[PDB]
Design a binder for this molecule. Structure first.
Ligand code: MG
Ligand code: MG
Ligand code: MG
Ligand code: MG
Ligand code: MG
Ligand code: MG
Ligand code: MG
Ligand code: MG
Ligand code: MG
Ligand code: MG
Ligand code: MG
Ligand code: MG
Ligand code: MG
Ligand code: MG
Ligand code: MG
Ligand code: MG
Ligand code: MG
Ligand code: MG
Ligand code: MG
Ligand code: MG
Ligand code: MG
Lengths: 171, 171, 171, 171, 171, 171
């Protein structure tokens, strides 16, 4: 590529793996969004919250695809795996799964950063630091806050918990 | 499901297959969008055109997921297969592939409609007719128009063809 | 902490020490602010300048406290030591002390960054780089500019120096 | 001091002690604010409520520092002691601690007023009456209201209590 | 310098070399701008494009000069070498030269970053990452896009190529 | 050149020399601008004044480059020599140097005009008279005014002189 410079093939490959992971995260959140709009779950603000998260993940994927093109790398897409469950059980369970998902994605981003550092790619490092790492920290913290409140409120067994959390925190 | 009424398990299953196909179409268009922003392709309006198509397909999938929930069906997601190519060759080739993709999706929607008709599900029939069938016809016609103009202009070999089409028609 | 990830206990501890240092810097500037509003000093723009610096330091402390919470660390507060003097002698002396204070705080932030780098915490590194390091450089440069002008003008002995600097530069 | 008039050295000293106490109160509230934004507490309106209280206490300190300067007294700062706890246990416990803190600060202000009265300093008396005494009464009453509601609601053990109080009363 | 801190003489020197390189890049683009406004070239949008690039390079130089002053380094200017050619041959050739120029400048910035990293200067690293590295990547990508389109269109020999590119892409 | 008319090769050459001189003047002023923003000089309005002069000189160069193209001449760039000093000593010294620089540039413009007159090029004469000669006279007069005031005020030794001149005249 006539634009390629200081861009290691390993970094290129890792960015393609990260693109897939971001699309996967988007899919997991899309699945959660629609679980909450089932007639037997019907927590509309949980639904909207996860739908919004899904859309943010798609943008995470797109920024990485754009990065690949900017650096002269070549996007290699792979199947986007379906989420682990179609039935997310409860608002609390979905939040705990989302928290695990974000920590796993964060671990992947940190490994990508370590690789970029090892390959002396400050541009890639800065890209990750600028658009991903703090976003992950904020997301993990937010999900943690949500999990804590849902647990304290008595979800999923306390009948008013998820309903009130949906209406107040996610409203 | 306490909301389920006149909703055949076969229709429920076919809607889940259609949801997957729509997500797949979205993925194909996302792939095309980013192929056109490669430094060695760089047709930005082809890129924007396909990105927009990708986003429309996601909405097609979401409406079907919403339909499933409204009718009391249960969404069962499957892996979203990667597109057939990562290198779409040219603006003309991508348009021809998009045309084939839309005809295939249309065939699937027509089969879904025939099933819905066979199962006496006027609501599903109307849903398909209202949000999908004419949309497909318009999309297929538009792609056909584009393919014709690109071919006539001499794409992909005539150096000015895709460039001019990108700037005038897709601009 | 269910949100904690890649956050070394040493980094957590260093952030708590930095929080204290920022609160201390805020206190030093608060002390300076009110020294300049004494009836026998009465340089109101020096007073306002330092009060503003004091408030900025409090925000520096708060961002670190927020960082601690985001990362899952636990804030451990310590006494905020009183400033070294209650009588800051002159506008020049206060500016020289502020310069020393900012260089000391900068050294602390650089040590924190080195620790974060050693612990492979790019998020913490980026946090420091984004909100602290350049802020320190700008502050040190500004104070240096002020010290130079006050010295050149003849402060503290030249009767018109601090008065004119207060009215023109800090006004 | 050429501005000093009818200002007893004992009053000057007591004002310096009060300045310290106000800074201490500010610190206690800052600590509480950030306890409520921990991922395992996550009551954001309790956090905002206490942060606001913290900022009000800083202004209480500043008004006393300004008073000292106006009267010709000399500000003598002392270490600001860290709060008694870093872990405030619960929204109810933090409110009860805040109530105790405000009653203690009020006792200090009343002793200051008695001293000012004994020294025949009507200006100081009026200053205390105007900016501090009623503020304390209003604060103590508000905290009392909050403590009562939290207790009645079943905090800290009733899972919905602090959550609902955070969203309704402190929202 | 009383503001100097953690600023290695080697970094200071490298920043002075980079300042010169940025001024040189500005000069190359100024030369290109005016080549395109020759009566026998007359591609006004190529002219405007390069003039704009020239002005951006001057700002790149100024930010580095400001950095030098902020850190306490001393700016040492050197002759700004004239560009390699006064006759840039064609719109395609000028774009290819600009691409080479930007890759060379990027290599220099990456070497500066490696030096700053070796000297443990996170502030300098962050400065480069924040204002230079991604800017270079975006510029190189843009030039690559332009080169690709001009080549595909048949520039410089196809009479309509540069003319159409000037009017559509650079317009 | 098919546009060339009544344009002597000597005039073409002299315009190229003048272009270089204008770029040189711009560089001298850029150097001065950043000397005044050193932490040990810190006269920000002197800095802004010279930066503005630098930018005006660049426009002087550009107008001559445009003139060359309009007349059918060919721009031949040469190295832009670095300024005689990096340390401009004082606000007064920089102003005296600027005055000498402008008188030297004016002498060059007057020689260019004499050449243009000798070659019977009224267009070139008028161009010089319209955009350069009076501009030089105004600039020389302004610098003279500044030098006089700085000298009278006691610069560079009188500590308040440059500071007050910076704040009042150049503010
Ligand atoms: Mg993501
Ligand atoms: Mg599988
Ligand atoms: Mg780094
Ligand atoms: Mg960075
Ligand atoms: Mg579709
Ligand atoms: Mg396969
Ligand atoms: Mg119908
Ligand atoms: Mg600070
Ligand atoms: Mg002590
Ligand atoms: Mg960073
Ligand atoms: Mg108080
Ligand atoms: Mg103690
Ligand atoms: Mg009374
Ligand atoms: Mg009264
Ligand atoms: Mg540059
Ligand atoms: Mg040479
Ligand atoms: Mg950075
Ligand atoms: Mg000039
Ligand atoms: Mg020389
Ligand atoms: Mg005339
Ligand atoms: Mg004045």
């Amino acid at each position: 590529s006539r634009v390629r410079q200081n861009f290691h093939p390993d970094s290129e490959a890792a960015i393609n793996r990260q693109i897939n992971l971001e699309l996967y995260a988007s899919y997991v959140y899309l699945s959660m969004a629609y679980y909450f709009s089932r007639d037997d779950v019907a927590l509309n603000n949980f639904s909207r919250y996860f739908l919004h998260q899904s859309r943010e993940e798609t943008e995470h994927a797109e920024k990485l695809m754009r990065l690949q093109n900017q650096r002269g790398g070549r996007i290699r897409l792979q199947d986007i795996k379906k989420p682990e469950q179609d039935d997310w059980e409860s608002g609390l369970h979905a939040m705990e799964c989302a928290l695990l998902l974000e920590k796993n994605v964060n671990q992947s981003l940190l490994e990508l950063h370590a690789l970029a550092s090892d390959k002396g790619d400050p541009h890639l490092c800065d890209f990750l630091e600028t658009y991903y790492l703090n976003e992950q920290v904020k997301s993990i913290k937010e999900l943690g806050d949500h999990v804590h409140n849902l647990v304290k409120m008595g979800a999923p067994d306390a009948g008013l918990a998820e309903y009130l959390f949906d209406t107040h925190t996610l409203g």
